[PDB]
Amino acid sequence: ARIAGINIPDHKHAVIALTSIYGVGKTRSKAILAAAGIAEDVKISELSEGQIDTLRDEVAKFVVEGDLRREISMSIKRLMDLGCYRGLRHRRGLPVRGQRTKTNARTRKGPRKP
């Protein structure tokens, strides 16, 4: 099952096995299995060519895994060439969405740099 990238998930319920691939999560998984008419309590055992390519076509109706990555990259390049406040915080590693820079921003700032 070389679908959507390198992931061959196995022995999972498909409702989580579709979250297992980058760029696709829970609600998208539920909608894909509804559009393919697949029960939630199935396993990846006994899977066929139809059960590959119907899933891949229904997810190829969606933005996945390569162009999403370079879309994030192109948004970041657009903000850096913009030189906005948010672009400056993206380029210098500071929390963008209205946080406090003073205390406890270590997800964005990394570990403590003395």
Partner 1 sequence: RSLKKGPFIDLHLLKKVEKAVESGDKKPLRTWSRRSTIFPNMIGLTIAVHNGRQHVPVFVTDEMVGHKLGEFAPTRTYR
Positions in the binding site for RNA (CB under 7 A): 11-13, 16, 19-29, 41, 68, 71-72, 75-76, 85-86, 90, 94-103, 107-109, 112-114
| CB atoms inside a 10 Å sphere around CB 48 | 8
Residues in contact with partner 1 by CB under 8 A are 78, 81-86, 88
Say which entry of RNA, partner 1, none residue 102 contacts (CB below 5 to 8 A, set by partner kind). RNA
Nearer to partner 1, 11 or 102 (CB): 102
| CB atoms inside a 10 Å sphere around CB 17 | 19
In the complex, what is the shortest distance from the CB of residue 82 to partner 1, in angstroms, rounded to a whole number? 7
Query: Contact at 8 Å (CB) between 29 and 42?
Result: no
In the complex, what is the shortest distance from the CB of residue 48 to RNA, in angstroms, rounded to a whole number? 21
Q: CA 2 → CA 13, 40, 55, 96, 106, distances in Å?
A: 17, 21, 12, 37, 37
102 burial (CB, 10 Å; 0-12 / 13-18 / 19+) is exposed
Say which entry of RNA, partner 1, none residue 56 contacts (CB below 5 to 8 A, set by partner kind). none
In the complex, what is the shortest distance from the CB of residue 81 to partner 1, in angstroms, rounded to a whole number? 8
